[PDB]
């Protein structure tokens, strides 16, 4: 299927406490492969997946150079934005950036993105055509004007269309055994009596990869959504994921109900009954 690379950057100001905190992580699909922590001792870009260790010392010396340049720029942004929004110097404020590429099943460029947040909401972003900006704010329009003048869009496009996808492919090759695997969910159902009238059915999906998965309830072959509950998909700690859905049924009516599980690793979707 299709694949992605994504970088996540967080800068948090802390007034009185010296320099801002800056965290950076890199992903292919649902697997993290690099990190940087301004408060860690290394002061280098660190590996987080086995297969990235195939990269040479110029890789690590480049990535660290660039990640420190992202931090430095995000340190200047916290101060620029405080100005743009006429905020005090006493609160804590957050800058977030994310960028990367999607490729389809043929490993070719599908989509590219590059977007900025300030304090939990959009600030500025690069539109799908990768040649123009969407300012979320009157305040963002200043930023947009500066980037239009320096041709940032054009250099970002060259990255997203080119360098992004070229390196994505290269990771996919190098970590084939990890990144191109599919681990199908292990499925079971459980039963817990709430009253004499009602029972909770819970349909489990454990140890799967990738993280995407659908769980749906049917009653008598029809899609059932009422009196159901579905948790957010949660990391197991060993690179696989977990999820469960639950429905509350009337006593004696358990057999009407089916759980349906769709996953890259289930060619035929699974139907579980009680």
């Amino acid at each position: 299927g299709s694949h992605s690379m994504r970088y996540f950057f967080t800068s948090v100001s802390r007034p009185g406490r010296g320099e801002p905190r800056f965290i950076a992580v890199g992903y292919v699909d649902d697997t993290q492969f690099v990190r940087f922590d301004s408060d860690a001792a290394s002061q280098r870009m660190e590996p987080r997946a086995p297969w990235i260790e195939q990269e040479g010392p110029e890789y690590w010396d480049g990535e660290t150079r660039k990640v420190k340049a992202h931090s430095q720029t995000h340190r200047v942004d916290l101060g620029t934005l405080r100005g743009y929004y006429n905020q005090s110097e006493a609160g804590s404020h957050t800058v977030q950036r994310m960028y990367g590429c999607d490729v389809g099943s043929d490993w070719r460029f599908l989509r590219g993105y590059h977007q900025y947040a300030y304090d939990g909401k959009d600030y500025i972003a690069l539109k799908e055509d990768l040649r123009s900006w969407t300012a979320a704010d009157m305040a963002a329009q200043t930023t947009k004007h500066k980037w239009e003048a320096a041709h940032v869009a054009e250099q970002l496009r060259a990255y997203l269309e080119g360098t992004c996808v070229e390196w994505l492919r290269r990771y996919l090759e190098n970590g084939k055994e990890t990144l191109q695997r599919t681990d199908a969910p292990k499925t079971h159902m459980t039963h817990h009596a709430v009253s004499d009238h009602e029972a909770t059915l819970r349909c489990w999906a454990l140890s799967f990869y990738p993280a995407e998965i659908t769980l749906t309830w049917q009653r008598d072959g029809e899609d059932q959504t009422q009196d159901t509950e579905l948790v957010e998909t949660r990391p197991a700690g060993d690179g696989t994921f977990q999820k469960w859905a639950a429905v509350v049924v009337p006593s004696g009516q358990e057999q009407r109900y089916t759980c349906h599980v769709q996953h890259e690793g289930l060619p035929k979707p699974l139907t579980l009954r009680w």
């Binding site: 660039k66 340049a69 200047v76 620029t80 934005l81 960028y99 600030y123 930023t143 500066k146 360098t163």
Partner: peptide, 9 residues
């Protein structure tokens, strides 16, 4: 592989 673009906003 990160981008080289780091312009001030």
């Amino acid at each position: 592989h990160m981008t080289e673009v780091v312009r001030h906003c």
